[PDB]
């Protein structure tokens, strides 16, 4: 998260961090239920073996309420490839059930139609993670959250140097220095509708971090909603 704001106590419960053998935070993720984590599809390349942490707002200080879970199975989207980055979405099933508490709750999965017209048409959106403070900078210790505006689907394709499929979408700023970055990837993008949050999108990619004339590219959850279910219900 570049710029943005610090998730205070209880604000970003759905947050999820994937950690590597060295217990290092490399990717984000979103809590859907007890044994299901939503993450990017490419984040399943950034490591050999990983666990997913929950209820952590500081990557150094053991604030008591942290907790680690192992991965029991990995559901990566078949129509994926880094050539295009289309279908950047993956569902993780945990070996042991996430027990909810403070700083550890789930994000609602909205209905496709109502989401595509009431959530996505919303002004802003919430993206968060333990990513870098600036493009070529350091990873973050404290968990951050950034309110990124929904960016015109059309002026999304211009600004971009690559194809922008309707399986993904823009969001962020033109000049202002606020965006996601390395590490935030796979994390969550949630819309706040009437005091509750839904899983509107996944942190995917972007030309640099907070670069003028570029927007943050996320995966379209609705575009995969029914896919998401089949994964949890397994298949």
């Amino acid at each position: 998260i570049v710029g943005g704001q610090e998730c205070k106590d209880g604000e970003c419960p759905w947050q999820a961090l994937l950690i590597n053998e060295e217990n290092e935070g490399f990717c984000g993720g979103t809590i859907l239920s007890e044994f299901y984590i939503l993450t990017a599809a490419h984040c399943l390349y950034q490591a050999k073996r990983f666990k997913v942490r929950v209820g952590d707002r500081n990557t150094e200080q053991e604030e008591g309420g942290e907790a680690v879970h192992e991965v029991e199975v990995v559901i990566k989207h078949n129509r994926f490839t880094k050539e295009t980055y289309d279908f950047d979405i993956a569902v993780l099933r945990l070996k042991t059930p996430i027990t909810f508490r403070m700083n550890v709750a789930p994000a609602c999965l909205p209905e496709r139609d109502w989401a595509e017209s009431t959530l996505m048409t919303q002004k802003t959106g919430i993206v968060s993670g333990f990513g870098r403070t600036h493009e070529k900078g350091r990873q973050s210790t404290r968990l951050k959250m950034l309110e990124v505006p929904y960016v015109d689907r059309n002026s999304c394709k211009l600004s971009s140097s690559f194809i922008i499929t309707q399986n993904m979408f823009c969001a962020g700023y033109d000049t202002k220095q606020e965006d996601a970055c390395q590490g935030d990837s796979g994390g969550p993008h949630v819309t706040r509708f009437k005091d509750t949050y839904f899983v509107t999108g996944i942190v995917s990619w972007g030309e640099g971090c907070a670069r003028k004339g570029k927007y943050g590219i996320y995966t379209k959850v609705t575009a995969f909603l029914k896919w998401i279910d089949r994964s949890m219900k397994t298949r």
Binding site: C12, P13, W14, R101, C108, L109, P110, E111, W114, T118
Partner: protein, 51 residues
């Protein structure tokens, strides 16, 4: 009908049952008695910041 008037005065999802508007809620929520607002069955419902 008119889930676009103000979400059909719902709390979350809103639908149009031909005639009029139909509200509903996400996993872990039960539709209140007025058929609009949503009520959480557990202490840790999806979509809520935990305080």
């Amino acid at each position: 009908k008119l889930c676009s008037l103000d979400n059909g005065d719902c709390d979350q999802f809103c639908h149009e049952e031909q005639n009029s508007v139909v509200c509903s809620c996400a996993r872990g929520y039960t539709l209140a008695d007025n058929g609009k607002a949503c009520i959480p069955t557990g202490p840790y419902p999806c979509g809520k910041q935990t305080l």
